[PDB]
């Protein structure tokens, strides 16, 4: 279930799942906490901008949300988590299997009610502690005491009392002492909602049959009764702006406002939220404000505002009806299709069964917007035919988008269910286009495609004809008729030369788009279901009905790779941007990544819900998928973008049960030396050879033109007097006798000791190794410090060291450079004593090896003579 290439990132397009949202105040500002499946999101009330998201997904779905100042409490299963800025600060685990249902926090007490009518009280260990952690006591409400707990509320100015509201009646529990202070009279109708009023001792109770009660706890008596026959109260809220208003939300999707002072109805907002998804699940007046925030199960959050009265006198009577202020939303049902709008990962296009198309922004949620379905006026001038009652376009089965001509004309084509024409949209305007493309053969639209240039749109009909329209003018230009069954895929190469089609009849047609000719036809064993064309590589994969993905090269019209392993139908698949991977999803609840070069499955996942779509970002950073459940889009991060991934084939049997290293990582490190006989340069920069030979002249250029000014009184040993790293040759310490010019024993340099050791051992491999590691300045200093006085042992030894190096044929271009520096620094000494046998013998041996390395000159001279001739004449 864990992928080695992909990891979940977040969900897109979901604002609320229907659980009542929580409102908390930080200073003068307000924020709203909404539940999204197993995670909650925090919005700023002023702008509805996303601020925080829960760091980790809870093991179980969240049931309750309560927020007080910085801290947010989220209840799931039998555990209550405490979050600050979306990061968990402490997890409260109850000691009973009964799941938490309701949650209340007043002062240092946290009250959690389980579904078995048991109330757990947690207290702060210290009065100054930010949140309660310590377990205080347990209070249980028995059936004789009352019915099932409806909600836990705390009224202001009540010392250590919790007002437990049950279906039968209301109860007053003293949390400190754990005793039942007061029991209210039984109510004929089932209670569904409770809300503390801004007045003292009064809590508003909402019944199941459209009755709202202003129950007074101090007197224990009814005060008022509002009646809403044939309705169910889902939320209640009071206006604290100085106006005695009461907003009653209903499961029908209506929000009613009452004026308590005048005993009248101000206004009713009809169908603000869908009845099918629970209507008004939560509707709360912002404290001290005329703004009311409403939510529902339809994945939407809205805000309404009361404007000031237009009458200079009697403003209380002339109440402006509430006005829509701002809202956030998404699909009400799972998206059916998705697509990346642009090369970068800014925007995604989404379509859902709710007949609405959305443009979702990954970089910021506020940028997400719904594309309008308002139709343009017809060019001919005739009246457009349609029902006066406005309805959204049918569900979108397919979509094709290009950005070559964005802002110039239509750049999206969409196919709709049971519809004989395709509609166009404009991404720049975010509105439906002015063209409609018809199949012209009495068949439904099954495939839509666009050319890279953005000028042509291709429509595939269920009767087998491919019609080609022009996006700018919407004029039918060409019609191809090869397939006799439905065309399930159309694609055109980037060059606009070769066009490929596939259909349920199983044939793959290759057309020359410009010449309009049938280049070839290829028959496959099973009907083809879908196509994805990779324009850069000229490869396209086909999802066959035999549970295989067949990769075909359009240039040669042959099958190159065939992929097996899926146990059921392949819902969707996509190419990686580099053209090296295919990620496919199937009905068997798995997502597999396939490596085309080796033609094997390298990664496997098991999704709880079948993934209906899969899409790579053109960058390759992100992978977006949609599932049969959930209104949002799951975004995955591509781990391969930050490290190499092994291409070893996944184990099939272990995967089913759950339901050469250089080649594995697609790399190769060049050998140190292909053969001993072959000359090989050093493993390093090629400027080292040039830096060594011309060191002095390069440094003269480096010196500043004007001498720097310095203080006359300067420490003589400043460079050495350093607090403590410098690894230069100057900063060398001796390692542990008659005076010797080269170096006295116990006072000898590391290099000279290695040189003397090599001379006795008759091998300078250790010396040659350290020479290569020396810096260019260090190399010059050592050679120039070589002993130049009789019997000339060190010079002879150095020549023997270099002569050995040339035999190895490795790093020879440094050894030539070292010998060049030796003559430069000790040429006169060698010249004056050329007749000395030791120098003469050592020099002669060097020439014997050096003479052999003249074949390289012949190779260089040949290639210049030919390469100059071949390129010229």
């Amino acid at each position: 279930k864990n992928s080695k290439i992909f990891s979940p990132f977040r969900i897109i397009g979901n604002v609320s799942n229907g659980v009542p949202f929580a409102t908390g105040t930080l200073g003068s500002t307000f924020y709203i906490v909404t539940c999204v499946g197993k995670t909650f999101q925090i919005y700023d009330a002023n702008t509805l901008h996303l601020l925080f998201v829960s760091e980790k997904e809870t093991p179980s779905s969240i049931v309750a949300l309560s927020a007080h100042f910085h801290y947010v409490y989220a209840a799931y299963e039998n555990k209550v988590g405490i979050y600050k800025r979306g990061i968990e600060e402490h997890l409260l685990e109850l000691e009973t299997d009964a799941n938490v249902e309701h949650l209340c926090i007043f002062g240092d007490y946290l009250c959690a009610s389980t579904d078995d009518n048991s109330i757990f009280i947690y207290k702060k260990s210290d009065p100054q502690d930010k949140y309660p952690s310590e377990f205080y006591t347990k209070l249980t409400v028995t059936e004789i005491q009352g019915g099932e707990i409806v909600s836990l509320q705390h009224l202001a100015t009540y010392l250590n009392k919790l007002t437990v509201v049950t279906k039968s009646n209301v109860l007053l529990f003293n949390v400190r002492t754990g005793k039942l202070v007061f029991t209210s009279n039984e109510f004929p109708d089932q209670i569904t909602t409770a809300e503390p009023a801004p007045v003292l001792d009064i809590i508003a109770l909402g019944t199941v049959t459209g009755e709202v009660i202003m129950f007074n706890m101090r007197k224990g008596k009814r005060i008022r009764t509002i009646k809403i026959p044939q309705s169910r109260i889902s939320s209640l809220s009071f206006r604290t702006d100085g106006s005695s208003h009461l907003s009653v939300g209903t499961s029908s999707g209506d929000l009613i406002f009452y004026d308590l002072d005048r005993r009248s109805r101000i206004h009713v907002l009809k169908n603000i939220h869908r009845e099918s998804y629970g209507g008004v699940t939560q509707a709360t007046f912002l404290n001290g404000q005329p703004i009311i925030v409403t939510s529902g199960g339809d994945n939407s959050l809205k805000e309404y505002v009361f404007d000031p009265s237009l009458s200079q006198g009697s403003g209380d009577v002339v109440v402006q009806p509430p006005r829509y202020l701002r809202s956030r939303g998404g699909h009400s049902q799972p998206p059916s299709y998705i697509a990346f709008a642009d090369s970068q990962s800014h925007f995604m296009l989404s379509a859902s069964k709710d007949r609405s198309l959305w443009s979702f922004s990954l970089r910021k949620d506020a940028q997400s917007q719904e594309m309008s379905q308002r139709l343009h006026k017809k060019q001919d001038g005739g009246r457009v035919g349609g029902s006066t009652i406005k309805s959204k376009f049918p569900e979108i089965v397919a979509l094709a988008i290009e950005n070559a001509r964005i802002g110039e004309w239509e750049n999206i084509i969409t196919a709709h269910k049971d519809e004989k024409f395709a509609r166009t949209w404009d991404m720049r305007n975010k509105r439906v286009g002015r063209w409609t493309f018809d199949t012209t053969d009495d068949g439904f639209v099954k495939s839509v495609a666009m050319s890279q240039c953005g000028n042509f749109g291709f429509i595939g009909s269920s009767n087998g004809s491919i019609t080609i329209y022009n996006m700018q003018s919407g004029i039918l230009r060409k019609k191809y008729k090869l397939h006799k069954r439905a065309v399930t895929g159309i694609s055109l190469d980037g060059m606009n030369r070769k066009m490929v089609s596939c259909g349920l009849d199983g044939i793959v047609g290759f057309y020359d788009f410009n010449k309009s000719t049938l280049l070839g036809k290829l028959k496959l064993d099973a009907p083809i279901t879908a196509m994805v064309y990779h324009r850069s590589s000229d490869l396209f994969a086909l999802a066959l009905d035999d549970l295989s993905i067949v990769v075909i090269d359009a240039v040669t019209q042959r099958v190159v790779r065939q992929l097996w392993g899926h146990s059921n139908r392949i819902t969707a698949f996509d190419f990686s941007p580099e053209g090296r991977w295919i990620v496919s999803a199937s009905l068997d609840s798995t997502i597999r990544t396939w490596d085309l070069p080796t033609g094997g499955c390298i990664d496997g996942i098991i999704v709880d819900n079948v993934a209906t779509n899969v899409k790579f970002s053109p960058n390759g950073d992100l992978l977006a998928t949609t599932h049969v459940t959930g209104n949002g889009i799951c975004i995955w991060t591509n781990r391969a973008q930050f490290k190499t991934v092994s291409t070893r084939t996944i184990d099939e049997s272990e995967f089913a049960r759950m339901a050469l290293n250089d080649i594995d990582f697609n790399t190769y490190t060049s050998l140190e030396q292909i053969d001993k006989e072959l000359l090989t340069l050093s493993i390093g920069p090629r400027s080292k050879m040039n830096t060594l030979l011309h060191l002095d002249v390069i440094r003269k250029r480096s010196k500043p033109k004007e001498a720097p000014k310095k203080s006359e009184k300067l420490p003589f040993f400043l460079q050495l007097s350093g607090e403590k790293v410098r690894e230069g040759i100057a900063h060398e310490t001796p390692e542990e006798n008659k005076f010797k010019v080269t170096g006295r024993l116990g006072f000898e340099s590391h290099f000279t000791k290695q040189l003397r050791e090599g001379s006795q051992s008759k091998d300078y491999s250790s010396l040659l190794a350290t020479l290569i590691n020396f810096s260019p300045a260090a190399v010059d200093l050592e050679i120039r410090s070589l002993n130049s006085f009789e019997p000339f042992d060190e010079i002879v030894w150095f020549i023997d060291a270099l002569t050995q190096g040339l035999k190895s044929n490795k790093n020879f271009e440094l050894y030539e450079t070292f010998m060049s520096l030796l003559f430069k620094a000790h040429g006169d000494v060698i010249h004056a004593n050329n007749k000395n046998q030791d120098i003469a013998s050592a020099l002669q041996n060097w020439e014997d090896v050096h003479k052999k390395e003249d074949r390289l000159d012949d190779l260089v001279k040949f290639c210049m003579g030919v390469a100059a001739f071949v390129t010229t004449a």
């Binding site: 400027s687 040039n690 830096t691 011309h694 002249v697 390069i698 003269k700 250029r701 480096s702």
Partner: protein, 50 residues
């Protein structure tokens, strides 16, 4: 300078004149900018000049 910038450098070039320059023999590496590289190693004076 001010007039040339004001006219967007659409001025009329100055009359041509001849002047003498002295070139001193130096290694070609010195004339280059300071970096860990050199492009040419020749001398600044040709054999005819010497």
């Amino acid at each position: 300078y001010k007039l040339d910038v004001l006219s967007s450098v659409h001025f009329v070039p100055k009359p041509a004149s001849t002047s003498l320059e002295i070139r001193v023999e130096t290694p070609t590496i010195s004339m280059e900018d300071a970096q860990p590289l050199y492009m040419s190693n020749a001398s600044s004076l040709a054999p005819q000049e010497i």
